[PDB]
Symmetry: D2
């Protein structure tokens, strides 16, 4: 039966609300993951430039 009772209809709206909230949650968890990754990136790059400099100073 395609028709929803009032209770089914309110629960469906709730669930949609919840799904959209979870999407936003997961988008921020993704932003947090990239913050981590970028911090790693920056620190690797500082270590890389330091070692290039080391090698070239011992040229």
């Amino acid at each position: 039966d395609h028709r929803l009772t009032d209770r089914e209809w309110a629960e469906e709206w709730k669930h949609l609300d919840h799904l959209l909230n979870c999407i936003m949650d997961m988008v921020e968890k993704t932003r947090r993951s990239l913050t981590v990754l970028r911090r790693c990136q920056e620190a690797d790059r500082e270590e890389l430039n330091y070692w290039i400099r080391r090698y070239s100073d011992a040229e």
Copy 2:
């Protein structure tokens, strides 16, 4: 320490992969919710037009 071991770095990429997959999952669960809602909408509208017609036939 901002730098990730190789294992931490592979796990971070994994987790990002997983987060993005979950977002896509939840977007499709949302599409499914709206399919439900629209089917309810259409069936309510058919019932509404039927009852308007009923009332007007008993005018």
Copy 3:
């Protein structure tokens, strides 16, 4: 030499950040379109209950 400058890396992560921002915006835009559609759906639902009752009072 195929590896990025500091500025190129900074652009990359900013571009990622922008994409996530576009996703959030698109979701909160969905959330707001849905507030209005629930309202429209409810008007139809309750209008159905209305005609049904007027029909019953009239017998």
Copy 4:
């Protein structure tokens, strides 16, 4: 009379569907930007290990 026609309702749900489609597209676009950035990050990581080893061979 403030309730929507059949066509207006059909537009509404199609507009929702489009927004979800835009979200999916934005996510799979993130997924593809990330494949390239992992590659760039890895080039830097391994280039670091490289200079470290050449430095050690040279003492």
